[PDB]
Structure 1
């Protein structure tokens, strides 16, 4: 309720104190509740590209890193206008640190991490970070301690590293 000025804890991924508006369940615009899904770098980049191409098509009706950057710049200029410096920086950051290429690989990754039955924040971090070993991932992400077996995390990171291309 109002609660006047209520105190709150400081956010920390170690404790997973993301926030009152970053809870696991969020009420969607349709009125029902959906799990808080988080996008990894490649998945977020694909989502951005899909949104931009859809916007470009709606306006119209009404791979290598260099060519990808040229295409995204041209499409950004054609679709939207100005004041997109933050968007341009995010887009180039995503293209530079692009862990995956197309829909098939990101879909396989997301379904694999869904099969892990783990927290969306943790699986998104695992998909984004390109870790190598298991203890390295555990020390990088404190939230993964005492949640999954060491061998299972190691092997799933092995498949993720195998799926890495370019």
Structure 2
């Protein structure tokens, strides 16, 4: 028993994500696993993939506006009360997502995983739309001295190459 009571300050720039958000995570089974970070588009796909599955469970036993209504009606039908927070997230994700279908995201994941960057960094790179290497170097300070501008410049171009819509 040791009450050392010393904790490093959390910071995204230093990639010090905390004590419960370490890179090496332990799942429920007990085997060590790498932390998985999801971008805005990836989170949108994963969340609504469970909502449709949730709808199937209970039953068994497109432009922005029309999609927003479809999610909204689906949200209320397949979720209980006190869902005000979930509604805000889905609405926020739909208006800021950069990938629509699973195919585009799958290509993106296979694209950015070649850099060997931290899960936090790759998620940030797939979350914020950057046009120049300098734009990503300043908005994401952790990228500094981790990837050359040559690779970053082409990665940004290719990321925008498959931009949705």
Task: Give the TM-score taking structure 1 as reference length.
Answer: 0.96
Looking at structure 2, the residues matched to 43 and 119 of structure 1 have their Cα atoms a distance apart, in angstroms, of 16
What is the aligned partner in structure 2 of residue 20 from structure 1?
19
Alignment check: 8 A CA contact 1:42 1:100 kept: yes
- Runs of 4+ aligned structure 1 residues displaced above 4 Å come to none
Offset at residue 9 of structure 1 (A): 1.6
Task: Give the TM-score taking structure 2 as reference length.
Answer: 0.97
**Structure 1 residues 86-125: aligned runs within 5 Å:** 86-125=85-124
Matched residues, number: 165
Aligned-partner SS, 2:33: strand
Offset at residue 29 of structure 1 (A): 1.1
Looking at structure 2, the residues matched to 68 and 5 of structure 1 have their Cα atoms a distance apart, in angstroms, of 51
CA RMSD between the two structures: 1.0
Offset at residue 3 of structure 1 (A): 2.5
Looking at structure 1, the residues matched to 104 and 143 of structure 2 have their Cα atoms a distance apart, in angstroms, of 24
Alignment gaps of 5+ in structure 2: none
Offset at residue 118 of structure 1 (A): 1.1
Is residue 133 from structure 1 mapped to residue 126 from structure 2 by the alignment?
no
Offset at residue 5 of structure 1 (A): 5.6
